[PDB]
Amino acid sequence: SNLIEVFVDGQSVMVEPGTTVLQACEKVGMQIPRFCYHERLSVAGNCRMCLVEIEKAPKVVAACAMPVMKGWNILTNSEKTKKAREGVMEFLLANHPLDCPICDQGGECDLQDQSMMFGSDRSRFLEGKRAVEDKNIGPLVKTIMTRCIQCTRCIRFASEIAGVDDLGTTGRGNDMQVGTYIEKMFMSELSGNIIDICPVGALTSKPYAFTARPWETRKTESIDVMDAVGSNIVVSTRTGEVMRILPRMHEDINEEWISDKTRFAYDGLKRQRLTEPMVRNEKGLLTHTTWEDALSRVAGMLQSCQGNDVAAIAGGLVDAEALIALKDLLNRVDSDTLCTEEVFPTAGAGTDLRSNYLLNTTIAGVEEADVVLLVGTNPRFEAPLFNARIRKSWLHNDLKVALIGSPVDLTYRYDHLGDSPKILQDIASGSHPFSQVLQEAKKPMVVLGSSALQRNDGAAILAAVSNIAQKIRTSSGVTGDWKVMNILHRIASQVAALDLGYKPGVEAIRKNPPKMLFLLGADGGCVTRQDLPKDCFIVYQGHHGDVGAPIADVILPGAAYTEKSATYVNTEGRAQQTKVAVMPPGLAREDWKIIRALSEIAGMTLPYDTLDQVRNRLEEVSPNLVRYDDVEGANYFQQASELSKLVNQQLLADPLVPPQLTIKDFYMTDSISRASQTMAKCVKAVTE
Amino acid sequence: TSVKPIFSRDMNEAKRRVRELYRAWYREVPNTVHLFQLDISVKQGRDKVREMFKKNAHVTDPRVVDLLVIKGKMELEETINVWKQRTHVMRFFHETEAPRPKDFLSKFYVGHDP
Amino acid sequence: TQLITVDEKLDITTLTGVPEEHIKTRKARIFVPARNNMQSGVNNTKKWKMEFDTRERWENPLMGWASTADPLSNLVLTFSTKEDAIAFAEKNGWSYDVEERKVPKPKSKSYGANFSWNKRTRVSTK
Amino acid sequence: PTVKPPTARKFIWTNHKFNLSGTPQQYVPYSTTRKKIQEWVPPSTPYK
Amino acid sequence: LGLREIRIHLCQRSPGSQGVRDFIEKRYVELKKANPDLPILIRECSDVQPKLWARYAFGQEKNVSLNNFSADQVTRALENVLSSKA
Amino acid sequence: ALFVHRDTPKNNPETPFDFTPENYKRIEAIVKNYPEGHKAAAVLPVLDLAQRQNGWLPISAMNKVAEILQVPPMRVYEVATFYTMYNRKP
Amino acid sequence: TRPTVRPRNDVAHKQLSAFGEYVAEILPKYVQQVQVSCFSELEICIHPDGVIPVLTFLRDHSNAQFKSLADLTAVDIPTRQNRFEIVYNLLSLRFNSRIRVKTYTDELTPVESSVSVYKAANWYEREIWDMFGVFFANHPDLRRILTDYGFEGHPFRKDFPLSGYVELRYDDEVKRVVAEPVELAQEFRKFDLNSPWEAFPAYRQPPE
Amino acid sequence: GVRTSPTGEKVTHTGQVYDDEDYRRVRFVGRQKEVNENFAIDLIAEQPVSQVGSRVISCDGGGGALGHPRVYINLDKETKTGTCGYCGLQFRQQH
Ligand code: SF4
Ligand code: SF4
Ligand code: FES
Ligand SMILES: [K+]
Ligand SMILES: [Zn+2]
DSSP, X not given: OOOEEEEETTEEEEEOTTOBHHHHHHTTTOOOOOSSOOTTSOOOOOSOTTEEEETTOSSOEETTTOBOOTTOEEETTXXXXXXXXXXXXXXXXXXXXXXXXXXXXXXXXXXXXXXHHHSOSSOOOOSOOOOOOXXXXXXXXXXXXXXXXXXXXXXXXXXXXXXXXXXXXXXXXXXOEEEOSSSOOOOOTTTTXXXXXXXXXXXXXXSSTTTOOGGGOEEEEEEOOSSSSOOEEEEEEETTEEEEEEEOOOTXXXXXXXXXXXXXXXXXXXSXXXXXXXXXXXXXXXXXXXXXXXXXXXXXXHHHOOGGGEEEEEOTTOOHHHHHHHHHHHHTTTOOOEEESSXXXXXXXXXXXXXXXXXXXXXXXXXXOSEEEEESOOHHHHSHHXXXXXXXXXXXXXXXXXXXXXXXXXXXXXXXXXXXXXXXXXXXXXXSHHHHHHHHOSSEEEEEETTGGGSTTHHHHHHHHHHHHHHHHHHSSOOSSSOOEEEEOOOTTHHHHHHTTOEESSHHHHHSOOSEEEEEXXXXXXXXXXXXXXXXXXXXXXXXXXXXXXXXXXXXXXXOTTSSOOEEEOTTOOEEEOOOSSOOSTTOBOHHHHHHHHHHHTTOOOSOOSHHHXXXXXXXXXXXXXXXXXXXOOOOHHHHHHHHTSSOOXXXXXXXXXXXXXXXXXXXXXXXXXXXXXXXXXXXXXXX | OEEOOSSOSSHHHHHHHHHHHHHHHHHHHHHHHHHTTOSSOHHHHHHHHHHHHHHTTTOOOHXXXXXXXXXXXXHHHHHHTTTSOHHXXXXXXXXXXXXXXXXXXXXXXXXXXX | OOOEEOOSOOOXXXXXXXXXXXXXXXXXXXXXXXXXXXXXXXXXXXXXXXXXXXXXXXXXXXXXXXXXXXXXXXXXEEESSHHHHHHHHHHTTOEEXXXXXXXXXXXXXXXXXXXXXXXXXXXXXX | OOSSOOOOOSSXXXXXXXXXXXXXXXXXXXXXXXXXXXXXXXXSSOOO | OOEEEEEEEEESSOGGXXXXXXXXXXXXXXXXXXXXXXXXXXXXXXXXXXXXXXXEGGGOEEEEEOTTXXXXXXXXXXXXXXXXXX | XXXXXXXXXXXXXXXXXXXXXXXXXXXHHHHTTSOTTOXXXXXXXXXXXXXXXXXXXXXXXXXXXXXXXXOOHHHXXXXXXXXXXSOSOX | OOSSSOOOOHHHHHHHHHHHHHHHHHOTTTEEEEEEOTTXXXXXXXXXXXXXXXXXXHHHOTTTOOOEEEEEEEEEOTTSSSOEEEEEEEEETTTTEEEEEEEEEOSSSOEEOOTTTOTTHHHHHHHHXXXXXXXXXXXXXXXXXXXXXXOOSOTTXXXXXXXXXXXXXXXXXXXXEEEEEOOXXXXXXXXXXXXXXXXOGGGOOOOO | OOEEOTTSOEEOXXXXXXXXXXXXXXXXXXXXXXXXXXXHHHHGGGSOOEEESSSEEEEOOSSGGGSOOOEEEXXXXXXXXXXXXXXXXXXXXXX
């Protein structure tokens, strides 16, 4: 080791060379105060709050920027360190507006808190304060720029992580202002995260505005379900109502960021809600009814069905507990037809081996790669923090990214190879220029989008991409620990439904149409009543009336993701669990509770009563669904690739067009986001 | 694993104290039904005594059952001496409480509780 | 001697006066609380916390207040280590689940990296 | 207030009222907020 | 009335899963070619013991511990599953 | 004296600005004074060249300097509002 | 630091440190720690087997004469395996001084009752039975003192909720005050108040 | 600025009124629903906009220490007046 020895207040600590003073003090459990330093942004050094005395040095050093030399004694609590902190806090509070009551940052303000902890108790500023003109950067971020302390975390986030380059400083001196300088609207997929890292209330949440206050909120730690990234979140509630959604730091997923749908689609969670059971009346209209009547009218039809008479479509937001509940319920009637809306091709190995439908490398493994090939996807909007990790690897590891598909904006520069899928044969044959780039690389990463698998030639595309990945891995200098083949998912319910052995896509329903169809949250519109026979008994079970509920015969109001403790699996196979934040409104219930009560009415009672017993069943079907925050390695790419060479599906001539080309198509994808007024304001803002 | 006892060295002396406490409660119950002028029978109060003893019958720790005998003797001392009123004696009999749903199905019907 | 040997598992559920409904149906959660991303300070991520599963909060018909029937709704216990919290949950018969402590990983920072000759890690503004 | 009158405001009651408890003019409490969760209104048209 | 799915649970690194691992590297593919419409779900996990779940008609499931088996023993247990069909 | 832009009919992103071809040859000579890969270093002369042709800087000279140097427009707005010579009013 | 800072008393600090050394060397069988705070109070942390030998000593030694038991207290610290901290506060009227004798127990280990040393303790540790469940062996009349007669649990434990598990109302059917499982029309609103910044760097614990 | 629902019930300055099929109107049966009829959103809109000759104005709400904390309102936007965040008094630069 080449660790240098430094001293924090006399305590010896062994640090790597290049470590700053602030990190060396972090290693002994001391936290130097800061406003412009952030460990996921570049070093700025322009608030001077981190000034600390190195002893035998007649000048304080910016600890966020100064690297430790060997033998320094960092005096984190000496007298001139404290005089520096009080002076810098006095200058930060000189022009700062007396807005602490009317400010959403109050109670959770860095400026308030380390004014209390490190600055003076009073003022010497006998002058008039400046007042900055406000800006309009969109419907998500309220902007009150008098509160700005010019820390430039705006600009470093928008430039380095969001990759936007629209925020900046105009002017000079005390008149220097943060903004876009024009009436420009900062609408990224990661735009709300500037609300998080702004230490003051200059950037605040416009949907959350004025409604709550941090001390009275309860903090439930939970999981995002808006995509298959599986972002860790804090659902902060107050008196039984969801107030807002913050991120949790998870280094391997979402480092501390979330997308704007994750942050702001929580107000769709209180519109359009299914609160009571509904049945069809004598006139064909959905009328409110009791749970006994609804479950009896579903069980009387389920007892008459058998075999292929009953099927099921799982939706995009369904937990694994309800998935195995509905699978065991339809297996009691001897029905294997349990399908998802998102099509994965069952050719070759299919969903048997886990490796050919996971992001097998990791989200973290993007930092280990050196060539990333993206096929048929727009990862900016399908998985925005997978794209944020790609941009971080682009920025710091000099990652070479290529794309096969439409030339979308990914907030970095990629090598656009073309939108034709025939290029997937030109790289696999070695007649393409990027093929040698894939061969000479040491950590290649080939990501196929699951939205490209919605095409009719999805088996052919998956075969070609797996052929490329096994041409690289088995021949070139890939070690064997490194995974090349990767599939990026966009649906939170998909990977848990494939691990439980559903049949992805509704080909098993279009083949032989059932006379009874369950819809666990199936609002994709995949199978309408023009596909079914004349009187199909459609049972919708979910939390919104969006698409599948207006055509149902019996409606079963379900819990949403903030309303149940619920296992969801991301695109990299990591099983995770939400917690209960609020309870479901009205007579709405948790989903597998509904399925289990239906099974007790139908006389085919499932062998579980509580959530732990559901999870014992869930371990019985695949034991990685109960090992939380754990990515399990999936081997056997060779055998899945040898099975994929059997059927020669033909590639179509249609170019790879992802369904999401612009930020317009980002904000509404599921039943919670389409029922949101905030997402509607976002769409109306980006379309004008 | 070597702990300090309270009264009982092992479970035999402990069960002896449990047995003496059950004897004392069984003897006390008719006087309790008389002087508090309860609206129950001696059979019913002795069944409540037996229920309160058999609720704790799964315990295998001598110190825990020593403290259970201590707290049972405190309950009995507060009953023999008229320190409880009729209300404190009848709080063992949850009479005004509605019967809870016991199966899965009625707990599903009434609310969210497991 | 004046000491006895008890090899049994420690259980005080009969002594703590707790109704059985709030022993065998509650899920204790042992966790270090995540840092509030509104703020950069880490003094709340130092200790372990035991919370419980949230139960039903409903609207009071008179005032609209949040009425509850959960006694353990406001019960947050603080522990120095993970093993203390696990021993306290097992001592009281609470079925628990444990999240691991998530630290931020050591970052590599360089102010000169903002001004590289050839790398993408240049800043375009400051 | 004949010597030092109170400061006149337009929102101050011109008519003072005594304790109205026990009358039909008494304060009855109520929640002043609107409805939190919106319900899904099903379509009034048939579905066939 | 008939077999519906097969589930094989195994570890990646435990020695008890070793023969099960040697069953998948050699004998799974011509297994899957022989049963093209039968879901044989291979589920690797961290520290599980090897296991063979057979689901039959109407939700009935049989359970065979594949712990410490050789690949021939895994093959014989799996062909007992494929030939029984209870 | 302000540091935000408001679109007037005489100062908007469709106000007509374009360099003369001799000014494009001057811009080529300016960009050749800097290393390849740091074309952004020619923001300050070329923008000043846009002021020497037009007399001042509407926000299409800023956009043209951002467009022909392939830098973001905000990175030109920062330069135009930082330095006291760039006349953002005629 | 003249006007607003509490002035430090160094003479009492020196005298209490010396007397703490005195107690620690007269009674090494039981004394585990001796400490003096910055506001000059002496804490003698002892083993629970020495409740009677230490407290008799301080009551009867000619250089101690702590003839007064001011207060007797338990403190529930659940992260400790001996979660209850029994705190004796003693007053010497002769030497005009106060001492604090702290010891420990858990739910099952009995503390020896100090009624033979100070009769003042007769209710106090009885309160410690009622509020905490700490049993005191050889107590004269150990029973509840503050809770209601049918009360289950010990309220000043920190895993005990703020409201109870039961609440009372009069019921006209049985003509009786009855106990029912507690429901609040407004839940007690938990406020998370702790700042995420360190307040006192002198009390910083070393990391793991 | 009070108005009335079709049930005959007054709508508050918040906007709260019970539905027709809501049973909780029975609490006002034989009694009264107490609303305040001085809506502050209508009263602050009656205040005339203050024309000032400066670029930044200070507002404490009037009364000095009896008002709100003194804040500083910028008036560079001529599209919009500058509103006090506490008191709602609005200001315009007269140039
Ligand atoms: S940003 Fe902080 S210091 Fe400034 S007004 Fe808001 S709460 Fe107060
Ligand atoms: S608005 Fe906030 S994040 Fe942006 S520069 Fe100002 S203080 Fe920093
Ligand atoms: S934190 Fe180092 S100067 Fe801003
Ligand atoms: K903020
Ligand atoms: Zn004002």
